[PDB]
From Swiss-Prot, chain B:
Residues of the whole record sequence present: 37 to 192 of 193
Annotated effect of mutating H101A: Abolishes binding of the preformed binary complex of IL18 and IL18R1 to IL18RAP
Role according to the record: Pro-inflammatory cytokine primarily involved in epithelial barrier repair, polarized T-helper 1 (Th1) cell and natural killer (NK) cell immune responses. Upon binding to IL18R1 and IL18RAP, forms a signaling ternary complex which activates NF-kappa-B, triggering synthesis of inflammatory mediators. Synergizes with IL12/interleukin-12 to induce IFNG synthesis from T-helper 1 (Th1) cells and natural killer (NK) cells.
Impact after mutating K9A: Reduces binding to IL18R1 and the ability to induce IFNG production
Cellular location(s): Cytoplasm, Cytosol; Secreted
Effect of D102A: Reduces binding of the preformed binary complex of IL18 and IL18R1 to IL18RAP
Superkingdom: Eukaryota
Name of the protein in question: Interleukin-18
Membrane-spanning ranges: none
Length: 108, 145
C-alpha cells in the first residue's frame, strides 16, 4: 500500500549460513527474464565461470519465480559449502531481461 | 566469455505486416500470410553479461538453428548446444524490447554488432545494419505458443 514508485530490479543479496540469496524484480515481459550466478577467482587469472563449472563445494538452486501486484520477483540461492575453496572468489548475481542486464557482486 | 543454455519458449514470430516467419522447403527463413512456423527461442546465460542472449531454432523433420554466419541469415542443421564457448556466436542473437514499440522485439547478431534480423521484401528474413531510427523492418511480434 506504499504510495511510491517500484524500482526494478532493486537487486539485493542477503546472506544466511552457507548461502547467498539474490532477489530482484522485473515488470516488463517477465516471461523473458532469468537470474543466474557467476564466480571469478580474484586471485587467479581464470575467466568468470558458471557455477556448475567450479567443481565441488558450491551449487546454485533453481530460480524461484513469483508474481504480485503486476511485478515478477526472481530469487536464486547460491550455496557455498566449501568456504575455504572460494575465499578469494567474487560472486555475481545476474538478472537478465528484455531491457538489459543487472548484476550485483558479493564476497564471502 | 561463454554461454550456457537455459529454458526455451515455443514461439510464433511475425513481422510488421502480420506475416509469419517459417522455414521453407529449401531451409530458407521466409515470411507468409503448423510446425515450420513454430520457433524455439532458447535463452542463454552469458559469463560476460550483456543482454538476453538467444538461439532461434525450428523442428521440421530435423532441428535447424538460425545463423548469421558470413553476414547472411540461414539455417544450420544442428541442435542449439548446451554450451557455446565463443564470446560472439553466429547462432546467438541478443533479443530486446524495441524502443518506442514496447510490445515488439528486435534481435541483434552477437557476431556483427548493430546488425539486426529484418524482414525484407518473396519476403525474406535478412541481416541488417540499423542505419535509421524507427526502422520497422527490424521489429517483430513474438507470440507465445
Amino acid at each position: 500500500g506504499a504510495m511510491v514508485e517500484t524500482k526494478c530490479p532493486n537487486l539485493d543479496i542477503v546472506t544466511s549460513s552457507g548461502e547467498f540469496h539474490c532477489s530482484g524484480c522485473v515488470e516488463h515481459m517477465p516471461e523473458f527474464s532469468y537470474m543466474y550466478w557467476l564466480a571469478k577467482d580474484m586471485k587467479s587469472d581464470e575467466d568468470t565461470k558458471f557455477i556448475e563449472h567450479l567443481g565441488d563445494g558450491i551449487n546454485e538452486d533453481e530460480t524461484v519465480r513469483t508474481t504480485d501486484g503486476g511485478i515478477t520477483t526472481l530469487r536464486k540461492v547460491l550455496h557455498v559449502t566449501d568456504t575455504n575453496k572460494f575465499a578469494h572468489y567474487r560472486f555475481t548475481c545476474v538478472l537478465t531481461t528484455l531491457d538489459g542486464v543487472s548484476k550485483k557482486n558479493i564476497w564471502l | 566469455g561463454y554461454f550456457g543454455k537455459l529454458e526455451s519458449k515455443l514461439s510464433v514470430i511475425r513481422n510488421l505486416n502480420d506475416q509469419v516467419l517459417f522455414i521453407d522447403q529449401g531451409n530458407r527463413p521466409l515470411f507468409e500470410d503448423a510446425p515450420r512456423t513454430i520457433f524455439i527461442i532458447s535463452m542463454y546465460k552469458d559469463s560476460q553479461p550483456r543482454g538476453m542472449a538467444v538461439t532461434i531454432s525450428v523442428k521440421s523433420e530435423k532441428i535447424s538453428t538460425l545463423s548469421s554466419e558470413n553476414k547472411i541469415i540461414s539455417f544450420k542443421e544442428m541442435n542449439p548446444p548446451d554450451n557455446i564457448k565463443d564470446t560472439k556466436s553466429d547462432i546467438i542473437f541478443f533479443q530486446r524490447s524495441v524502443p518506442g514499440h514496447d510490445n515488439k522485439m528486435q534481435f541483434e547478431s552477437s557476431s556483427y554488432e548493430g546488425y539486426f534480423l529484418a524482414s525484407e521484401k518473396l519476403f525474406k528474413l535478412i541481416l541488417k545494419k540499423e542505419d535509421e531510427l524507427g526502422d520497422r523492418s527490424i521489429m517483430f511480434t513474438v507470440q507465445n505458443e
